[PDB]
Design a protein around this ligand. Sequence first.
Ligand code: 5M6
Ligand code: MG
Ligand code: ZN
Length: 314
Amino acid sequence: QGLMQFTLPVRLCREIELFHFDIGPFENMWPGIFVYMVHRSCGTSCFELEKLCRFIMSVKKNYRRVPYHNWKHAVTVAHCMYAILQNNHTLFTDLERKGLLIACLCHDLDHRGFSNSYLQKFDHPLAALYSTSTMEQHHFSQTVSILQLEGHNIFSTLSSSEYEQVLEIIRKAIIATDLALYFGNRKQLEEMYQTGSLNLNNQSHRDRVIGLMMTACDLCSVTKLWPVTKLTANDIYAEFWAEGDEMKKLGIQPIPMMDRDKKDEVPQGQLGFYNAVAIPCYTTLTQILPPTEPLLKACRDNLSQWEKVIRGEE
Ligand SMILES: Cc1nn(-c2ccc(Cl)cc2)c2sc(C(=O)NC[C@H]3CCCO3)cc12
Ligand SMILES: [Mg+2]
Ligand SMILES: [Zn+2]
């Protein structure tokens, strides 16, 4: 180091601070963007540059060449977290800031572009190993593995205590990314919020809130500018439809969302998702963390665009 501040071009330097920032098509800039974010979010001091770079590069290696659940997604998810963190400065511990960005970069490690359901149906070994939140348990495993590679311990300066804590933040963060788990998490959060029992001092409560953050960051493509949103959806469905094909191969009619023959149903399917998942998520998040409100606003914006698609206004 250490007088070695990462910098971005002006337009990026500015726009990176906003929720709706798109990380762009230049793959080779993404590590730098992450490092920037970490340094800004955490400090230049939180990690050994050399170690961090090495870690980042290995993580990258371990993301596959799938249409959606790839390295770009990783970095995209991290950036939304960075925005949250940066707009809610004083709310988060030092350990949290460290762990959370890392969690996000690692949260879909070695993803195959297939759902937990498919894995179960196919009878994949991972399904036997991990009976719930299959892929998520895997992602965490892979994170630990990489952390354990020579010269990849970015956590090396932390005490034994602090280290166990950070890894525990990360584990919970990653597990939260299991959407099946989101619904109940949010319901509880909403109830607490409303009955005024929510208490950020209660770890158990903090956990929940971090969970929701996770989901939020994870779905952040719904919070982009429309053409980004629109184009990312293509990627999302490319995976769904491939899975659909695989379901059919196992002799199972897939859900229509995964049936490429039922493309026509996409817009309506987006509507449901926005309504059932996305909108509530950002709403409760805004309740708990008011400065995250732009995420809710952008989501609503995108809902409306899907309404327009349906009305053939595009
Ligand atoms: C519709 C739909 N749109 N998206 C979506 C949109 C935007 C982002 Cl940014 C991320 C996701 C999802 S994720 C999901 C889901 O996971 N369903 C679970 C189902 C499948 C397999 C069996 O159970 C269903 C949808
Ligand atoms: Mg995932
Ligand atoms: Zn993800």
